[PDB]
Model the fold of this input.
Amino acid sequence: SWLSKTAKKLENSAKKRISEGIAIAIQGGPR
Done:
């Protein structure tokens, strides 16, 4: 969707959260 085509770039920023969500976890940075 031309509407989701501009929002896709907004969700594309979440891809960093999924990649980190497993990374950080894999690092056990926190508790």
Remarks:
- The radius of gyration is 13 Å.
- DSSP finds two helices and no strands in the chain.
- The chain has one domain: 1-31.
